[model samples]
Target chain A: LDLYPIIHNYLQEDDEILDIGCGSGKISLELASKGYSVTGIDINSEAIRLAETAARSPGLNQKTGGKAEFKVENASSLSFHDSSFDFAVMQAFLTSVPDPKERSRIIKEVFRVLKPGAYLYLVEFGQNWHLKLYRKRYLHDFPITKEEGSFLARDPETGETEFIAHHFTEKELVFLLTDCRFEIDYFRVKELETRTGNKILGFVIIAQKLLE
Target chain B: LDLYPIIHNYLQEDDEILDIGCGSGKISLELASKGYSVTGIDINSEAIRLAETAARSPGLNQKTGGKAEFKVENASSLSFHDSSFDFAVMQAFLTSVPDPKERSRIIKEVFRVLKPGAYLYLVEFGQNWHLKLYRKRYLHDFPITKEEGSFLARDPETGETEFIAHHFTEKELVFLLTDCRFEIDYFRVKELETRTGNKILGFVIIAQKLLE
Candidate 1:
């Protein structure tokens, strides 16, 4: 889905942006093209290499009216100086983190580097109606696992373990944001349909750091 | 002078303390002896070595009921994790830093490393009646230089130049503290008389970091 159109409504040209866990150069390039100075950091070297290569392209380079740089940086332990960033964006990576403590660490680190009054854009999985129905019908009797809030999925080919997804409710997500001292500016649950005609959901939250 | 007795009044046993510009482990050991875990950092390697050696002494090691560690670290670029310290102490180092920009950087770094609601204790030279008389008589024709607020002094016998000192006023000091988002918790002007019958003043400020 083209979420950037809605996301772009909140951004300004002069903002210094940080793209956390930016896999390739997609969002970084797009934001840079719109005249924002962007620093895209991904822990994966291969993703950063591709991002750097794409960022160096002559056409895209010219298209990026502002500066764009990508680096291999572990999100939990960012090395930037204090108050170094104006805005930050995270995509689909929060649910992938295995430990909740690491998730909190990433949130606090992002809070540290960002300038007071800047915002963090997070796009992560949400426990919406579509996923609830799919999970209830195919696996568990209910949408969520009460104990760990995670459910196991089985691969159709070999009965092998596929993956687990933690679909966070709005209340659950809002609590986490507030726990890290972030103020909720905007939040929503967006619906999506899979290729298999199964419906799913996602969370788009724009949280602003307080003027500290 | 044993400044720790007075400084100890503001500290708690559970506080994670930082001793900035800790010279030879004196204050760190004393505080640690009083059951406070202390991380003492100084830019001087020789001083750090001496501090470490003293910390390892059998008597002092046991006397320091809590942990006491020393490291060679520049005040301006502290490498500790954000919100890693609860309290910090600085003695005359702020005025010792010739560059006001570097002094500000150190203050901001200390602020970054300290936990919210923590305090930073700074003992710095203050412009008082005696220092004004000395500066006017021995150094500058005027008592103060308004631009940088530093005065020049010359040795009579060797014809060598030396710095008189930067005696920070309450307004100027508070301005710098507020610039870094620190709230003044306590401030006092104290007097010290030299053997030469010269009276000088010093400021003891305890500034607290706020919950942002």
Candidate 2:
């Protein structure tokens, strides 16, 4: 999905944005190039290194005003102080975590770092019957987690588990955010094509931390 | 919700439209006033009569060209021939039906009646944690139906069971539409305030029949 325009519509030019779990800093760089200050974080050191490298590249260095910085940090234990940022963007991040409690912790961390009245732009996987393989894995093949929609994926060659993924329901998402005291502003389900040429359903949500 | 503009964006000036389970003809008359030909249908005779009466009201009768006709008919077994309409609108209609098979039959009838490439504009209830009373009823108070989210409500005073209601998941809605060969174009979950001052979640979907 072309998410730049959607993100742009929700943000102002002077916003200090946090890109949580920013793999390779694609969105972070895009935002910085458009004149927004952004901080991109990832648990993967290699991804953060690559993002830092890109940020210092000749093309990016030539940019005039806005800039992006990359950091290796865990989402559930963010390094930032409370209410540090104006806006946050979490794209396809929550689904990567297998544990329901970890997911809640990550969301709470995001909520803590965002200022009151700040918004969170979240994009994650939703249930899709079109994904027959994933559906089967979620149900029977993979090791079951505490949550119904979560599962662990194993490497075909090594037989070692790689990561956990969870598909969200609208109800589950709403409840999670509401429990964290974020008021849901917008929610939509849309079809998305994966890199492997499979059709999947995903959710786009904009939620706000209430003004105290 | 103000749906006229959303419906107007999808229809042409001369498109023939069907309003299934058009309670009191609210939407039907609104479409007619905007100069589209509309046929409103409802299983309730009193509702059809009220719609007919409104269609003939002095304010409505003075309209220029577009008109609406009301019929008392079963949605599961529509009297209209194949490819009868260019568009269809069903608002809060399916939730009232208690049976899963009956709901499928009704959707199939809608599919059979619409021309290729025509669209169905649907609005229905979605799972909401905000409705505490309804949530309690859905879990324990109401009689269980075949589906997990389906339940039959009861009259508080008389202890008489009333009609059935189903709260849909985005996954279920997608499966239902795709099973009927409709391509989903739009889907959103939004908060709606009921007439009784309760907040509820609702789904809005626009799905299209594939062109042959």
Candidate 3:
């Protein structure tokens, strides 16, 4: 109840959403239960199909009961028309870049789907000096390069990544938004508690869709 | 007033926006006109300058009142920071990417500026059945084929113009999106009339940011 209510309070009602990189449809199903036309897409078809089965278990299939559906999708080259939805959000996706240069294509895809004016929310890793330890410890196993002036260790490919280990800073985000034709609405960092209890984690931002 | 109203309405009252491929600031100037904090970028410096000039003009730029302006940017290679925009946009971009393997760097930069669960919009040339006719005509120029499906129109050693005509079918856009991780929302054809009032236009696709 609180989950749906609080979510509804913050989000618009009766909307269609695109869940990129959706591992499974937990959140997507929840949103759909409340009448939101939620489409959960993921590279993992097995996982997404499982989500579909889970959602169907409750018989929440047709819009008559409420809307919730899914498909297998890749983030970099989305296949939708412009102004297709009310909002687009990314959760915990800040560090997905294995290479720095490959980031814009994903951004471009997001740019493609957003309506002329829309809102995008992101909860991801922040630009903390401590996070470099994550990048350094996982460099060779990840897709990171030395070109990133910041602390995060991305693969050497610069902007190309088959595997993924991404990193970002606020300044970097701002500069990118400016270049990508976005206006910074709320770019800030928020600290969170990792599952390890004592471990601290944080994300660098929140922003909005500016224009055409 | 007609430009980017959907974007302006969705943006938070205190949003900092980025426009990655702002062309002539058609939307950027309008965003600035709306009183939101905006930063616009484009690959076309000349276009940005023109946008800025338009913003500073007397009558048309009244909405921004000179608050919004633009910068020159390359979509594939951006110089901005991480999660810097609330929204990012690309209208009819990268159809020129003839190489099947050259769209990642741009995706990386975009992810960096966006928060996480944001959306992106795209408008592009459709790879409808008619392009076959165009390709058939193009082949007339010198459709030399290799052993594989690939071909050479002419000898590259001659310093001639070798343009890669990248036509699109519906699935091509889906492949590109899945390759990077952005998920599709909806894809529809927004047919346009040709300048000569002869042929039809292209497609508009919409996708959202996703992260697990």
Candidate 2 chain A, run of 10 with poorest lDDT: A153-162
The TM-scores of chain A alone, one per candidate, are 0.83, 0.89, 0.72
Can you write out model 3's per-residue Cα lDDT over B1-212, one digit (the tens) per residue? 12323443345666676766676777766667666666787777788888888877655544443367577877676777776776666654555454555555666667667766666656555544455544443344335431111222221111123444344566776767666667877566766443223244465655666875
- lDDT per residue as tens, model 1, A15-121: 89999888887888888877789999998999999988888765554444587899998889999987899899987777666567788898999999998888888
- Chain A of model 3, TM-score against the native? 0.72
Write the candidate numbers in order of decreasing lDDT: 2, 1, 3
**lDDT digits (tens) for residues B1-212 of candidate 1:** 34634576778868999999888988889888777899999999999999988888655544445888999998899989899998999877776676778889999999999998899998876665354454443345234544344554432211233444465777889988999999988888877442223446778888999889
TM-scores for all candidates: the values are 0.45, 0.48, 0.40
RMSD of each: 26.6, 18.7, 26.8
What DockQ number belongs to candidate 1? 0.00
Residue A67's lDDT within candidate 3 is 72
Q: Candidate 1: which pairs clash?
A: none
Ranking by TM-score: 2, 1, 3
Instruction: Give me the candidate number with maximum lDDT.
Output: 2
* Fnat scores for every prediction: 0.00, 0.00, 0.00
**Best-fitting candidate, scored by TM-score:** 2
Where is the poorest 10-residue window by lDDT in model 2 chain B? Answer: B153-162
